[PDB]
Enzyme design. Sequence first.
Site, PDB file in Angstrom:
ATOM      1  N   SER A  99       0.816  -1.217   0.000  1.00 57.93           N
ATOM      2  CA  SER A  99       0.000   0.000   0.000  1.00 57.93           C
ATOM      3  C   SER A  99       0.844   1.258   0.000  1.00 57.93           C
ATOM      4  O   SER A  99       0.423   2.289  -0.519  1.00 57.93           O
ATOM      5  CB  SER A  99      -0.882   0.030   1.224  1.00 57.93           C
TER       6      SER A  99
ATOM      7  N   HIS B 142      -1.364  -3.754  -5.781  1.00 54.66           N
ATOM      8  CA  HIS B 142      -2.065  -3.502  -4.548  1.00 54.66           C
ATOM      9  C   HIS B 142      -3.417  -4.157  -4.733  1.00 54.66           C
ATOM     10  O   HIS B 142      -4.274  -3.637  -5.452  1.00 54.66           O
ATOM     11  CB  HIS B 142      -2.162  -1.988  -4.271  1.00 54.66           C
TER      12      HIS B 142
ATOM     13  N   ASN C  75      -5.677   5.139  -2.057  1.00 56.58           N
ATOM     14  CA  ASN C  75      -5.442   5.716  -0.722  1.00 56.58           C
ATOM     15  C   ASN C  75      -5.133   7.186  -0.831  1.00 56.58           C
ATOM     16  O   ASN C  75      -5.602   7.976  -0.012  1.00 56.58           O
ATOM     17  CB  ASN C  75      -4.348   4.949   0.054  1.00 56.58           C
TER      18      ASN C  75
ATOM     19  N   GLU D  94      -4.344  -2.194  -8.039  1.00 56.75           N
ATOM     20  CA  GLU D  94      -3.578  -1.098  -8.534  1.00 56.75           C
ATOM     21  C   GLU D  94      -2.319  -1.722  -9.076  1.00 56.75           C
ATOM     22  O   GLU D  94      -1.677  -2.509  -8.396  1.00 56.75           O
ATOM     23  CB  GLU D  94      -3.280  -0.071  -7.445  1.00 56.75           C
TER      24      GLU D  94
END
Lengths: 283, 283
Positions: free
Chosen positions: B118, B139, B189, B151
């Site tokens: 992450s 991810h 995020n 991702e």
Amino acid sequence: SIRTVGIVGAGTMGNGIAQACAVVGLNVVMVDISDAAVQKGVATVASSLDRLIKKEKLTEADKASALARIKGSTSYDDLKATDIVIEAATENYDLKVKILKQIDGIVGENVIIASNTSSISITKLAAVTSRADRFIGMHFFNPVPVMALVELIRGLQTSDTTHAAVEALSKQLGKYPITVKNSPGFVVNRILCPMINEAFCVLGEGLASPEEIDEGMKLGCNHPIGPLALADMIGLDTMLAVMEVLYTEFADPKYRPAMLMREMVAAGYLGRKTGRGVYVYSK
Amino acid sequence: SIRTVGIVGAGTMGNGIAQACAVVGLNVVMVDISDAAVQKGVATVASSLDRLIKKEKLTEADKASALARIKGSTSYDDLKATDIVIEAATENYDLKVKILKQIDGIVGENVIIASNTSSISITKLAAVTSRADRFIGMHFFNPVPVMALVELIRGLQTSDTTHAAVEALSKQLGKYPITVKNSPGFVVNRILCPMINEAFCVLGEGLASPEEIDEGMKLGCNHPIGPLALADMIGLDTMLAVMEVLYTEFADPKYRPAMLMREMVAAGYLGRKTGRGVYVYSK
């Protein structure tokens, strides 16, 4: 008690609010500058109510019943017959003021004046009336009948009493109240919109493609719509101004508008409404 | 082609990824430091597959079929039998490195090494391997079988070829790929988490109550869950570190952690996992 609600403005919010009261069996005095304006206010609530009956949302009688409940005038003296008045007519500040002074001019000392807004300082407004403690802010949401919430925004002056009145008034409309000390963007836009901004930054730095950016957020965080698409529906000019407000009112670059958002706006690429924003659209 | 996928780590992500390949009929070499670790990796995919058959998600045969497809070892030489290796075993940097060097040690020059993360700089990682262009970042999302996205994070070195391989590998798993130039927080995020932060700020400034803050966002923007609640599930310590990463990597106070978020974390109020974060929880 409150059984009769003043509304200034018969545009989208205006009837929006009007309707919402009426179906709850509440008496609405709905003012606006022409008879063209007032009645067209009724046309949309008419058209809107038609739709509801057409998916079995009760009924032809509850309809007629509501409509009756709604006394739409051009005399702003009709607001003497009212328990409380919701200005819902403009987001121009100078003009907004005048209206509230005018309203403050008609109604009695213990009648509450609320103003619907996304951006304008409730506390700055409240202070133009003769009884600030009877002034409160509301922020209804864009399809005002179905959307089940309102931000209740206390000016620094709003009384506890004015608050509870207006708080319960909302519960009675079937919306969820959200109490908020007056502050730039209140609650919803304050956290939503800078998120949208961050998206423009990401896109701006070419880290990813827009579609992919929207995908990432839809699927990853289970948001019904991605922020870039979302921005195209809100209007980028609207988005830009919200952020301009946050930077300017907070006086903090944390809230810098996204440069790509500035560029799209300067170019006239404003979203669904200009047919082009982040994506491109039919017409 | 790619028909055999290395996995280092048999914890939650590990089997997560393992499973996801297997049901697509893909051969998985799943390594981890004990036989206790590897087999417990299988227990969760077992238990997990049980559930699926128990809501008519095909079948007892497709199950057995998959399980067979999965060769779980403790010999990291088994990664020679593999087209590509996904390190999915830790978010410690020093340790992460060692593993990838080790992995880089076993597999052939044209075998791709991906690392799931992450927070960690794909470009910084890629550069510890002997062929960076064959290194890429992924991810996956926290319930890794049902969540339909990843991702795909290109280091500055990742080749176009490595990218498309891994891009199509994902489509074959039924996830949506999201290509992202390596950057703090990538896409998801990067915009989600600062939004969560803004919530803590709002709460921190006592503008509104938490429940109300969550209400505002659920109803106003139709998010399945409000950010404060959301933060309690992620873990505030996790939230804090994400933000610490953004501030530290970007070197920009725009991403200042929310002080209340700091206070809750310093206090040990970390969310669902400590039984107390923003809200308080059963146990």
